[PDB]
Amino acid sequence: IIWGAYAQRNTEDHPPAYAPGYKTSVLRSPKNALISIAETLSEVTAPHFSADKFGPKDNDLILNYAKDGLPIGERVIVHGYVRDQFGRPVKNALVEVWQANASGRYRHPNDQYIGAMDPNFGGCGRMLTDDNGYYVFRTIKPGPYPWRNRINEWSPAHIHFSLIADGWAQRLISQFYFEGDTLIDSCPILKTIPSEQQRRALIALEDKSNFIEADSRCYRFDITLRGRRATYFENDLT
Amino acid sequence: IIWGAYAQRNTEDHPPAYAPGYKTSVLRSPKNALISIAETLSEVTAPHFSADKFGPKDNDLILNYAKDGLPIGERVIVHGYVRDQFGRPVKNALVEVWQANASGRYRHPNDQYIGAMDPNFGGCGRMLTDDNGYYVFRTIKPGPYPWRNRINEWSPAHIHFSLIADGWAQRLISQFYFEGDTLIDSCPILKTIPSEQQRRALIALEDKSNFIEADSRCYRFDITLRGRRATYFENDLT
Amino acid sequence: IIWGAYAQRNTEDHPPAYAPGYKTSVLRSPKNALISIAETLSEVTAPHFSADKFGPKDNDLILNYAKDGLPIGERVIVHGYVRDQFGRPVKNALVEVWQANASGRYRHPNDQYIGAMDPNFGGCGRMLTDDNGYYVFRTIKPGPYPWRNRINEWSPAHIHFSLIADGWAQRLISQFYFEGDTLIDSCPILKTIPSEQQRRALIALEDKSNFIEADSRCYRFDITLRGRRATYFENDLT
Amino acid sequence: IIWGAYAQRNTEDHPPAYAPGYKTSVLRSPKNALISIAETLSEVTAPHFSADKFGPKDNDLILNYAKDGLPIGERVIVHGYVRDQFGRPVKNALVEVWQANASGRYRHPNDQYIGAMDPNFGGCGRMLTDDNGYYVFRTIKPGPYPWRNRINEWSPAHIHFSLIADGWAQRLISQFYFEGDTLIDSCPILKTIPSEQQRRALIALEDKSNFIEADSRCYRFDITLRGRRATYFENDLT
Amino acid sequence: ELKETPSQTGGPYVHIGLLPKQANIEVFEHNLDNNLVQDNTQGQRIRLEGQVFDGLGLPLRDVLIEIWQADTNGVYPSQADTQGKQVDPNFLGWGRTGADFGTGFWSFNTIKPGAVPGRKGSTQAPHISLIIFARGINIGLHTRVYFDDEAEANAKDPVLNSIEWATRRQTLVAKREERDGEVVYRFDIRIQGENETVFFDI
Amino acid sequence: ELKETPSQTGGPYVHIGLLPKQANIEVFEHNLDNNLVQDNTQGQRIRLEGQVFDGLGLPLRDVLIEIWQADTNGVYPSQADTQGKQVDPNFLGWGRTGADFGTGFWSFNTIKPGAVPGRKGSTQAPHISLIIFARGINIGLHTRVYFDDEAEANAKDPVLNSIEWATRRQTLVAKREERDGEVVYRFDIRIQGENETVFFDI
Amino acid sequence: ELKETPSQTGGPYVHIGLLPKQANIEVFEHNLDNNLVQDNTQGQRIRLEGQVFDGLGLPLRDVLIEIWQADTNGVYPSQADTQGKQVDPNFLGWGRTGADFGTGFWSFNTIKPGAVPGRKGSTQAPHISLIIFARGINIGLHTRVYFDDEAEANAKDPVLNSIEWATRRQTLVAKREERDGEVVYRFDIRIQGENETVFFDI
Amino acid sequence: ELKETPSQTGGPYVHIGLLPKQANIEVFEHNLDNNLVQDNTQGQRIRLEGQVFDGLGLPLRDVLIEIWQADTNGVYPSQADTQGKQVDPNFLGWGRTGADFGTGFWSFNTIKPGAVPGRKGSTQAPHISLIIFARGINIGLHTRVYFDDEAEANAKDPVLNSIEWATRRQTLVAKREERDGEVVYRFDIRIQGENETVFFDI
């Protein structure tokens, strides 16, 4: 199999850069259209991260920052599969996540909300997907976060994530929400995505059969990245 | 106006005593039918509690147990109206509430779940409704609670409540849930209630216009108690 | 009762500033997003106008400018209630209105339409709402007004209005239309409002039971302003 | 992969123990609720049966009891897949089946129905599923069986089956029916199952493409057992 | 018209909100309790005590109980009482207690109530109204406590006489005992089984 | 709950209903105007003036402006003011004016306001709240006017400090000038473009 | 995800498919039975016997029983056992029997099991897992058999201690007897009524 | 077929998950950073630095940047590189940094890359691929960094030549400077406005 280029990004499946309802995008969006290019080796390659460097608790947000005790909040496991748009598993991709604590408070110098900080929660983790494209991490369900877009803006509970996989073209950062949160229908950042079906693609589902008795609930969330086409005739990449 | 008896309790609007899906009800439910009686002064009177005895933080679950700092979790206000079945406001009724903390952990000697205890949260409050039947309290949204009915049973997030009002016949204890929690459809205690419309009567609604910017969300929850009929002919109570 | 801030303005319930179909908005709309602030005393106070200064015909557009006779046109009464978003009446609010005459002609130096001027009609009035939030004025139904947006633009018959009430944050200017006018579906100013339900909120309804025989028809039009939340815990306004 | 416990049995997907329409369950059902326990090694292990001990005709109910000739009746093949609730194949599970002959008569000392016995049919078989979870056996389609629940009770044609697989918790006995039998809607044993979708899960489907010309018809029937969750954090089993 | 909010069990941690001291939660200055006798309270002091038993004959060690009763003269300390009589001013008429977590015993320090008017000119025998809440119990169970030394009034009581299975009336009669000078009434409640206590829909 | 009535532009004839004298309509005996100083009004008299510019840099010659402000001691003449202080009794706190149809200049004769309490114990710098209505403007634009001679208070003002792009704070500072003994503050508003005036959602 | 296939009673002819010799059907060369002791099997030989009683106190004469247990050292002969220990190689760990059609007695010839690790580092007391299938029983009933001569280990067993109604724990303890040199454990099962045997959802 | 998961802004706290040390979170032993030069790394060392500016000409003080590039010989350290050449073994090819919260400056210590094959037998000029993430940015913005001392190769580069508005090509050329013996390339990015940096859809 000789791989050709990644399939084109479908711009209609993503938010536009300019979205006036999300106020900070007004001065941080280009006025010019993006210039599309044909892919080269630069766009189809990406770095490799070895599992060797990762600590044992890197995917355990419940324990990786715990000092005197356990963090306060809802114990949950999140797992799923990362696949490309042709359904092939994405192997050894780097997944990085970050989130607020159970109060909706972020451990960051620029976050000053009155929701309490948790001395035993950090809010960041990472993992590499396995050969089936599978990932799993454990954490505290974050609380909804108030912010100033309009003065009384509230985002639904969410976990931010980032993926670095096989090709630079696949580079992606997004966030997922939890099934049933009523704030999902009011979030102006979620509303930058044009279609309802793509908005639903960011919702992690309750996975009741995988709950662990007297311990933790579980959410199922799959991620889809751009995929490469196979070449059977001329190979123009190089 | 001369008051007669309370309207009959509609047994079809409540759970039966025997509900085998809620296991502990099997040995704690009478085998005999309840004996209905005609009401007397004993059933239509009830005690009076004076506001004078209540502390200033009795309805503030966020601060009434706080020692070194604030409790960890989602800051929420819950408010609503208590009315009788004829729509009249219930004045000066005693409302008592209790709940688990943000981890789904109760501050009780018999609760041993691994979800962390919060040194600054107690989980109980009380208030008297005002002359319009209105009540308001503030708290931390509780986390869903695991328990052993079937081994992997999980109840949705909820706040337990109790009402002592004008007549002993009105005496009631129940609990409310928060709009959108996906565990509501699986709870075997909620399923003891026969009809769907009564199950929905225990769901507190998101009240977005009453959210307080960069501070707290808000839920709206109204309670309905049995009501007394007015008498215009013979008064048989005495 | 201790009042806190007004509920946030829901920007999705109003027209955007930039609406290219309404041509003059293109150079008169900010390019930057509005900066939301938390309210202070400046935003929750407003002036008080005494009824003492108002003339007896100030709410009678049929007679307040009449010199030699009555104005030509359809005699109509418009009445309604002004309430805040929580349904509370808005007491002693200043309502000012202005409109074109029966020909669709405005009494203004910059209006040069061929529709005839009426020597007995001025086109402006004012009133204070009463303690129930009620208002009533009488006038001539205005005729639809031609203008140059596209060259053959016609607005439906309408009356412009302005409200100054309890808090500066409530400050509002809008206009209402009359039920059934076919031009309502083509007006580019009405189309700047995004949702159909908000567009319908500007339509005054025929109020047949309040018509006065052999005298005047009647329209019913209610106005809703932003409302203040009540505070039960910390009062941060000051 | 480190296996944790089997997922909880969903009691709502099975018949209750007490089902008064099936008369013998009235004195053979516990009055107490079942006591749920957390699983240990005892619940997740099970015996292993070697194929070596099985005879060549053990899954051929048409020939395994044939002495002077072939049994009378409809020649049918039944095949399918046994999977766990997560869709993984169940390998080397012991499947045992038993049924009445073509007259609806069982070869058992306690069965005295007038439907004729067949000297060449026994009515029992067994097999081990293969590595894909696949099973196949051949038999005579049983006739519907009359019995005394109400005096004129008739069960639809069916084959009883039993599974012993990987964990004792998976232990199961049930029965399947044949597509289209009109007695399926009247069977009081089938009606002990609460939901319609679970009742349909016991119906074997006609598999026309697998019929063998001038020989035998074929039915397709898949079985689902409880499945084990995988563990990625603490392993509490031991 | 509105439907009554449906009942749900109080559950095993009902002490947190209703008897915090029992859950070891000190949050309130004034805690509601099981002592209805104040220093100037009129009437004869009595102790009411017992256990609540489940269908296996075992005590509920997580049950919460409340009682509502009239004063010594049969007047309720409630604005809904229509007798036109002055009620004892140092009497709440209500108390709440929980069974001991180890033994299941519960008790109240109270006063013996006076007779209260029944319907249509009748007179009810002295009684205490009692309600039970606990895990496993979906709707609080109402019952009444009568006194064995009021045989005469009990025989004529309208409510007891409205129970048609007469052998069941005795389950509502508490037994008088005298512990070292104190008058104690023992009232055990049996939720299920033989001698099941009568429960009312009031 | 109800939704707020949606806003619509005031349009080019907004003078008819709000400044009839400017449209040459004499109908009212008492006309609301741009003079907030009454004979006994306390404080230092100042004139506030400027123009409103569109995206081509041209003045809006049909814009209507209103201001709301506190008295000389920082008290609002409104029942909603909670300071518990007596407000100047000869001060409305509000005025309305329209730009001249030929030049676009607008002005108000008013008083310089005193500092008003901000949230959570803070103190706001002296300011006037101002709103703009005109054809082309779908929702009135709110902004604030601060004074360049109050550098010290401006630097500590909560609202100005909540604008994160600091170069934009200066658009809200009016310039003090002294025309023949009168104190004049010049405040030009630029609706679009370079140096666009900050507008608030209040 | 898939739902588990629903259970259905085995019915009265369950012997045909599971114990054909009892239904007088000779079809298989190797028949599964109730003898778990092979010649080289390690451990102390014991006989387990009893009857199963319905709600009228009568024996089920059509019940089928199976047991699953560890070897003498507490290791299960299953690939799912994770102890890293060698299991007795001459031990299946499972057996099946049916009650006698006339008397209802059932029995197994087996070995007394060794203690097996419980969860989180605990140790379970010796036990045999047992399941019951019969006409009238819609889902096989799981229970456990403990031994009365293991008082010490029984008192500390995690499963027995997780039954909160303590009087019910004794129904899971079989009685040791010694019939002519043989060790016999009698375990009667009572499906309904007084002394109803504890059944688990495993 | 599946649709790509939609992008969402990284937001202002993107440092928590991607540069924890910058948010003052010590949780990992090995932290990804902005230093691509290891001791044995081949090639000429260079520093790449600049600021990112918004539409008001102000620096983004919360932007996160990543670069991907080839080694000194123009080979990518990725299994997807098909040149059949050995890549420098002490080179990751990638780094991540965040702008300083106070000044907005960002930088990387890296190596100058060698030329990489373009499509259909062409040769691309040396370049670094760069992506920008920040609050306000809904989808990471891709751009490329070329070097002003590679005039000759830049003029023939396929990607630069595919930008039809030729005046925009210069925004992708970084300026070489020599700070005290070190080679520094300054590359400022202007998200909006005059001299807006070219962004690609790759």
Ligand SMILES: [Fe+3]
């Ligand atoms: Fe976030």
Ligand SMILES: [Fe+3]
């Ligand atoms: Fe609870």
Ligand SMILES: [Fe+3]
């Ligand atoms: Fe108009």
Ligand SMILES: [Fe+3]
């Ligand atoms: Fe059968």
